[PDB]
Amino acid sequence: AGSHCQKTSLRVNFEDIGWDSWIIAPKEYEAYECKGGCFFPLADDVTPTKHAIVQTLVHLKFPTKVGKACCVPTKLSPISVLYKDDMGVPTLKYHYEGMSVAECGCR
Amino acid sequence: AGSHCQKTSLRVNFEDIGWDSWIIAPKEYEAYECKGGCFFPLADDVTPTKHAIVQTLVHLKFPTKVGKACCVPTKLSPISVLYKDDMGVPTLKYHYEGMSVAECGCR
């Protein structure tokens, strides 16, 4: 094998990130994260874009002058949050988009 | 201001990256790259996903245990390439997708 950009656990506490004046509930959620490398040889269990492949090759050849491809979320999922509105009313946002990692990849 | 994830020049030579047995022309192309940081405060000239914002906050708080959001291509464009087929014939691939950066963002 070789490199392994993959989804791993990341639990986030809203108070810790300064959002608790606005997000009442939940207190914490599973955001996940993408970690691991993008270097050859790759996983036959993912697909980078051609640009990521190109950049990976150039980085191997000229490491000081172009950076690596980066392991990032390529698809995200919503969560539900209970938030204080402007009239100060607790309101359910049923699908708060872009909150949790669904898929990771090299980009 | 603050962080600045942005598109910058990156010219790529196909021979240098080992592709010249397959790509006859062009010899080089403008792939571009995305460089710069994803840290607060952000550009009012881009939009990260909520997960990137969340991860940026957690990284600020707990830097040794979650990594930063990463500046990556968020949209790509094709180029035309002249390639040797299997019968060894030079053939135009008019839109070879995913080859050049169109837009960058923090993810």
Author numbering:
A (entry chain A), B (entry chain A): 4 to 110
What does the paper say about this structure?
BMP9, a member of the TGFβ superfamily, is a homodimer that forms a signaling complex with two type I and two type II receptors. Signaling through high-affinity activin receptor-like kinase 1 (ALK1) in endothelial cells, circulating BMP9 acts as a vascular quiescence factor, maintaining endothelial homeostasis. BMP9 is produced by hepatocytes as the prepro-form and is processed by proprotein convertase in the trans-Golgi network into prodomain and mature BMP9 ligand. The endothelial ALK1/BMPR-II pathway is constitutively activated by circulating BMP9, the only confirmed BMP that circulates at active concentrations.
Here, we showed by chromatography and a 1.9 Å crystal structure that stable BMP9 dimers could form either with (D-form) or without (M-form) an intermolecular disulfide bond. A single crystal contained both D- and M-forms of HBMP9. Because two previously published BMP9 structures were either in the M-form or the D-form and crystallized under different protein-protein interaction contexts, our crystal is unique in addressing the local differences between D- and M-forms of BMP9 under identical conditions. We solved the structure to 1.9 Å with a space group I4122. Indeed, Cys-73, the critical amino acid involved in disulfide bond formation, was in two conformations as demonstrated by clear electron density, with an intermolecular disulfide bond formed between the two monomers in one of the conformations. Interestingly, no other major difference could be observed for the remaining residues between the D- and M-forms. Overlaying the HBMP9 structure with the previously published BMP9 structures revealed that the core regions of BMP9 were almost identical. Loops contacting the type I and type II receptors had diverged conformations. These are also the regions with the highest B factors in all BMP9 structures, indicating an intrinsically higher degree of flexibility at these regions.
